Design a protein around this ligand. Structure first.
Ligand SMILES: CC#C[C@H]1CN(S(=O)(=O)c2ccc(N)nc2)CCN1c1ccc([S@](=N)(=O)C(F)(F)F)cc1
Ligand SMILES: O=P(O)(O)OC[C@@H](O)[C@@H](O)[C@H](O)[C@@H](O)CO
Length: 585
C-alpha cells in the first residue's frame, strides 16, 4: 500500500501497559532511550537538574554488570582501543603517505575538529608534519553552524572523504556517529571497506551493533547496521574496528550532543594520546596506559561536579535572562572559547532558540577591542555574560573586558581552570564574588603543551556549559518530561524521533500517528498517495520550514480532530507548552 515501503520497519505502538512486554523498549536504541533518572526532569529545580545531569554523565564510567551490554571499562572495548592505538602507531612511523581522518555529522563533527587540532599541535610541538584532519557533514562551515540537514547523504560523506584522501597511501578513518546513525558516516565506512589496501575504517558510537540504524538511506543501498555488522566481521582479521561502549541514555532523550560528544572525547583522546605517548617510548600501548587516562577523565567528572551549587546558580541566571527576553554571552579564550560557541549554536536546533539567545565568543572570533566596540554597546541590565579561561590565559585581556561589562551588566559569573597554587590576580577580583574555580591536581605530563591538562579542561567546560544551557531551557518549561517535543524536523532521524514521540505520548497506532504527522507537515495540502509514498527527505524539506509541527500533530491525535481544528486550538491557548500539557491531562 502507498507508504508501506517507507514505514514498514516502524514498530507498532504497544497496548497501554505492555511497552516492555511487547519487546518494544528493548529495541529502542540506547541513544534514543528515555533515561529513568530524568523522567521528572521537567519538574526538577535547578539544583536537582545539575544533580540528575551529573548522574547521567557519570553513567559514562559505570561498569558492566554480570547478561548485558559492553561498556567503556569492559575488556572487549579496552582491548579494541589497544588494537586501534596499535594501528595509529603503524601510520605514525610512516607519515609519508599517511593520514588520519576523524569524521561525523553535527556534534560528532564538532568533536572531530577539536581533536584533529589538538593532535596536530602535539606533532607540531614535536616538529612532525600534522597527520590529522577532520570531516564534518556540510563542510567546514558546519563546525560552528546549526546545520542538521547535511548528515543525510552517504554520497556527500564519500566525496568529502575522497577529497582529503588525495593520493595518500594509508588512511585511517574514524567515523563518529553516536547513534550509529548518520548516513554521512555510513558511506565513509562502506567506501573504506571496499578499499582495504589504503583505508582502515574505525567506527565509533554508543549503541550495540544490533541497535544500529537500519532504515534505508536515500542515496545508498546498504544500511548503517549492515555496514557496521560487516566491519565487526572484518575486526577478526584486524582490517576494521567497532568501538561502541554503552554509556546509557541522554538525560534529554536523544540529545547526543551531551553524553555522546563527551564520551566521543573521553574515548578518542584517551586512545590517540596513548598511541602518541607510547611510540617515542618504543612500547606497545597497553590497557594500563589507557586506564591511566580514563581514570583521569573520570576524576575530572568528580572535580567538575563538586562545583554543583555554583553551576546551579549560573543556570538560574541564564534561565532568568531568557525568561525575560534577554541574551547570554559565553566569552572564552583559545579552545574553551570554541566550545562556548559550539554550545551556543547547538541551542538553536536543540531548543528552537534564536542564535542570539545563547551566543559563543572566542578571543564568533571577535577579538578584544572588537568585542569592546561591537557587542559591548548592546548589553543590558537583564543579560548574562560568562567568562571562561585558564590562569595561563592573559588575564589583562580578561580583566579589561569584564571591567567594561560590569557597568553595562552586573550578572557576570566565571569559569576558571587552574593548576593548584595558581592565584587569581586582583584580590578584589570581585568582579567575581562567587567564581567557579576549578582547581586541578598536578599530573605528570611530558608533552610540551600539557595535552591531558587541555582535555580535562575542555571536557569539564563542555559538561558545565551543556548542563547550564540545557538546564536553563528545562527550567523555562520547554521540555516535556525528558523529551523535547517541539523540535524542528530537519533530518530523517529527527523525523523518526518525532514519529516515536507521537506514538509514546498518544498511545495511538503507527498509522494514525504517521497520518497526523504527515498532515501537520504538509497542511494545507491533504494526504495524496504521492505524499504517503514520498521519501522521508520530502517531508523533512517541508517540515524544516514550519513551526510547532509536532505539537499540532499531537493535538490532532489527542482530540481526534482535524489539523484545522488543532491549529485553532493552539492559537487560543496561552502557550504551546500549556496546550500540550493540558491536552495530555
Ligand atoms: C519511529 C522511531 C524510532 C527510533 C529510531 N529512529 S531512527 O532515526 O530510525 C534510528 C536512530 C538511531 C538508531 N540507532 N536507529 C534508528 C530514531 C528515533 N527512534 C526513537 C526515539 C525515541 C523513542 S522513545 N523511547 O519512544 C521516546 F521518544 F519516548 F524516547 C523511540 C524510538
Ligand atoms: O553522532 P550522531 O548520532 O550521528 O548524531 C549527529 C548529529 O545529528 C547530532 O550530533 C546532533 O546534531 C546533536 O544535536 C545531538 O544533540
Amino acid at each position: 500500500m502507498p507508504g508501506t515501503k517507507r514505514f514498514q520497519h516502524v514498530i507498532e505502538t504497544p497496548e497501554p501497559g505492555k511497552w516492555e512486554l511487547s519487546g518494544y523498549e528493548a529495541a529502542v536504541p540506547i541513544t534514543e532511550k528515555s533515561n529513568p533518572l530524568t523522567q521528572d526532569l521537567d519538574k526538577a529545580d535547578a539544583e536537582n537538574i545539575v544533580r540528575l545531569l551529573g548522574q547521567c554523565d557519570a553513567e559514562i564510567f559505570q561498569e558492566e554488570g554480570q547478561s548485558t551490554y559492553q561498556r567503556l571499562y569492559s575488556e572487549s572495548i579496552l582491548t579494541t582501543m589497544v588494537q586501534v592505538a596499535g594501528k595509529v602507531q603503524e601510520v605514525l612511523k610512516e607519515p609519508d603517505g599517511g593520514l588520519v581522518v576523524l569524521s561525523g555529522g553535527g556534534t560528532s563533527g564538532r568533536m572531530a575538529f577539536l581533536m584533529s587540532v589538538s593532535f596536530n599541535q602535539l606533532m607540531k610541538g614535536l616538529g612532525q608534519k600534522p597527520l590529522y584532519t577532520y570531516l564534518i557533514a556540510g563542510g567546514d562551515r558546519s563546525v560552528v553552524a546549526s546545520r542538521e540537514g547535511t548528515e543525510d547523504s552517504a554520497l556527500h560523506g564519500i566525496e568529502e572523504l575522497k577529497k582529503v584522501a588525495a593520493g595518500k597511501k594509508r588512511v585511517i578513518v574514524i567515523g563518529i556517529s553516536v547513534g550509529l546513525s548518520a548516513p554521512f558516516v555510513a558511506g565513509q565506512m562502506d567506501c573504506c571497506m571496499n578499499n582495504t589496501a589504503v583505508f582502515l575504517p574505525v567506527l565509533v558510537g554508543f549503541n550495540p551493533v544490533s541497535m544500529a540504524r537500519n532504515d534505508p538511506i536515500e542515496d545508498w543501498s546498504s544500511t548503517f547496521r549492515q555496514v557496521a555488522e560487516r566491519m565487526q566481521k572484518m575486526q577478526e582479521k584486524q582490517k576494521a574496528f567497532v568501538l561502541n561502549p554503552a554509556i546509557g541514555p541522554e538525560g534529554l532523550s536523544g540529545s547526543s550532543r551531551m553524553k555522546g560528544g563527551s564520551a566521543t572525547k573521553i574515548l578518542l583522546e584517551t586512545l590517540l594520546l596513548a598511541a602518541h605517548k607510547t611510540v617515542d617510548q618504543g612500547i606497545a600501548a597497553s590497557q594500563r596506559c589507557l586506564l591511566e587516562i580514563l581514570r583521569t577523565f573520570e576524576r575530572a567528572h568528580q572535580v567538575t561536579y563538586s562545583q554543583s551549587p555554583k553551576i546551579a546558580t549560573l543556570m538560574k541566571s541564564v534561565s532568568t535572562s531568557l525568561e525575560k527576553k534577554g541574551h547570554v554571552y559565553l566569552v572564552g579564550w583559545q579552545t574553551l572559547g570554541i566550545i562556548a560557541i559550539m554550545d551556543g549554536v547547538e541551542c538553536i536546533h536543540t531548543f528552537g532558540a534564536d542564535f542570539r539567545d545563547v551566543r559563543g565568543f572566542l578571543i564568533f572570533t571577535f577579538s578584544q577591542e572588537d568585542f569592546l566596540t561591537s557587542i559591548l554597546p548592546s548589553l543590558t541590565e537583564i543579560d548574562t555574560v560568562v567568562f571562561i579561561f585558564t590562569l595561563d590565559d592573559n588575564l589583562t585581556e580578561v580583566q579589561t573586558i569584564v571591567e567594561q561589562v560590569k557597568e553595562k551588566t552586573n550578572h557576570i559569573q566565571a569559569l576558571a581552570h587552574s593548576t593548584v597554587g595558581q592565584t587569581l590576580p586582583i584580590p578584589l577580583k570581585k568582579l567575581f564574588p562567587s567564581i567557579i574555580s576549578i582547581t586541578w591536581p598536578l599530573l605528570f605530563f611530558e608533552y610540551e603543551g600539557n595535552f591531558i591538562q587541555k582535555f580535562q579542561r575542555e571536557l569539564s567546560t563542555k559538561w558545565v556549559l551543556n548542563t547550564v544551557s540545557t538546564g536553563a531551557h528545562v527550567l523555562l518549561g520547554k521540555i516535556l518530561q525528558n523529551h523535547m517535543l517541539d523540535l524542528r524536523i530537519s533530518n530523517s532521524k529527527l523525523f523518526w524521533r518525532a514519529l516515536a514521540m507521537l506514538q509514546r505520548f498518544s498511545g495511538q497506532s503507527k498509522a494514525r500517528c504517521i497520518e497526523s504527522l504527515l498532515r501537520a507537515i504538509h497542511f494545507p495540502q491533504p494526504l495524496s498517495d504521492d505524499i504517503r509514498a514520498a521519501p522521508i527527505s520530502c517531508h523533512v524539506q517541508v517540515a524544516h520550514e514550519k513551526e510547532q509541527v509536532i505539537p499540532i500533530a499531537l493535538l490532532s491525535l489527542l482530540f481526534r480532530c482535524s489539523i484545522t481544528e488543532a491549529q485553532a486550538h493552539l492559537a487560543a491557548a496561552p502557550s504551546v507548552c500549556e496546550a500540550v500539557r493540558s491536552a495530555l491531562a
